Design a binder for this molecule. Structure first.
Ligand SMILES: Nc1ncnc2c1ncn2[C@@H]1O[C@H](COP(=O)(O)OP(=O)(O)NP(=O)(O)O)[C@@H](O)[C@H]1O
Ligand SMILES: [Mg+2]
Length: 380
């Protein structure tokens, strides 16, 4: 039979435990770690947290500590439960559905930490607020320890600590990728100037710390250091408005070499790019086309295409949006339609102006793009 009883209604964290693939990267637990790290970074971005400490424990569990405002522990006026339980056990429950708690945040779904909870054998949360320390714990997504006061601390000492033990049953490998972890963490320090980021690995017995006042430029430069580039130092630019901002560092490696191509939205690494990256690409192409067309150095029958200025472009792109739109909980791609035009406009304007005031380096770049077009033409 196929009647009403055939329809099942999953509630709480059950959908995450039943369909893990839709909520996280099941390759390894690193992404679970990023959900937690992102939440701490959002506090730093809002200017509340000054540091985020991450610890990979010998038992392969992960602990993330921040000195932000701390997760709210008071009773929710409508749900009648401490905000903390709500945040940990309910999907689509969070403080980033508006811009009242954070102006620019990587979080927006009200799902992250609850996914960490659903896929962990155990989760311990500690909050420091009002000169008091609170504790609450879960196992397999279910609360096993009610919110309780575990002591006193300085009134000015506030923050959140999350320690979780991933359930190996949901991942290809239960081991945390160390290189991925440090790559993600260093980037946070680069993208949020002044915030101190630390990573203590107790499996391999190491400890690192990252804190950069400048950031972008050196990050790209060092990544390509020792490789011929054009121009000699990265082309950088930025624009900041109330609801949006864009920052970048880029250059080309025409003679070959490993390219660095990273894009971010509210410090969330968008590994699959998206509309913001499309904008950067289009802007660079529009400006180069203008330079070539005006200087009349474009051979008859030769038309530049995106590939001609993108193929060997190494770049780091960091965008801020009051209300981004990602294609999935993993946030690998930004699908926010208007961000393409936004980035494109800023980049084209900055690049054409830079080109016009750096004629020598510009002509070399132009030659690089044109020869690429002819190479591509002869190929077809
Ligand atoms: N370390 C923290 N400090 C202060 N508040 C926090 C912290 N972690 C979580 N919260 C809050 O709890 C809410 C729910 O977290 P979460 O379920 O991860 O949703 P999210 O922030 O929208 N992220 P995401 O689902 O990945 O887009 C957040 O929106 C914050 O209001
Ligand atoms: Mg939630």
């Amino acid at each position: 039979t196929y009647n009403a009883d055939a329809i099942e209604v999953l509630t709480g964290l059950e959908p995450v435990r039943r369909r893990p693939g839709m909520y996280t990267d099941t390759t390894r637990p690193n992404h679970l770690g990023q959900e937690v790290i992102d939440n701490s970074v959002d506090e730093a971005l809002a200017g509340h947290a000054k540091r985020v400490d991450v610890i990979l424990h010998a038992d392969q569990s992960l602990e993330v500590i921040d000195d932000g405002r701390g997760m709210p522990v008071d009773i929710h006026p409508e749900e009648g439960v401490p905000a903390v339980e709500l945040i940990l056990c309910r999907l689509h429950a969070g403080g980033k559905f508006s811009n009242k708690n954070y102006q620019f945040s990587g979080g927006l779904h009200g799902v992250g930490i609850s996914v960490v909870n659903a896929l962990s054998k155990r989760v311990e949360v500690n909050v420091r607020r009002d000169g008091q320390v609170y504790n609450i714990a879960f196992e397999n997504g279910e609360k096993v320890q009610d919110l309780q006061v575990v002591g006193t601390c300085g009134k000015r000492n506030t923050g959140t600590s999350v320690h979780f033990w991933p359930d190996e049953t949901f991942f290809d490998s239960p081991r945390f990728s160390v290189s991925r972890l440090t790559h993600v963490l260093k980037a946070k320090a680069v993208l949020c100037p002044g915030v101190e980021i630390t990573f203590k690995d107790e499996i391999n017995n190491t400890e690192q710390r990252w804190c950069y006042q400048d950031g972008l430029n050196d990050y790209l430069a060092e990544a390509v250091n020792g490789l011929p580039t054009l121009p000699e130092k990265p082309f950088i630019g930025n624009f900041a408005g109330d609801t949006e901002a864009v920052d970048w560092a880029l250059l080309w490696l025409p003679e070959g070499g490993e390219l660095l191509t990273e894009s971010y939205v509210n410090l969330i690494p968008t590994m699959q790019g998206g509309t913001h990256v499309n904008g950067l690409r289009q802007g660079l192409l529009d400006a180069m086309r203008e330079f070539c067309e005006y200087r009349n150095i474009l051979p008859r029958g030769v038309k530049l295409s995106a590939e001609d200025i993108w193929d060997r472009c190494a770049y780091v792109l960091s965008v801020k949006m009051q209300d981004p739109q990602f294609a999935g909980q993993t946030k690998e791609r930004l699908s926010s339609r208007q961000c393409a035009a936004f980035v494109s406009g800023v980049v084209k304007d900055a690049f054409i102006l830079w080109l016009n005031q750096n004629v020598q380096a510009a002509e070399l770049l132009a030659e690089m793009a044109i020869s690429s077009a002819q190479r591509r033409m002869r190929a077809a």
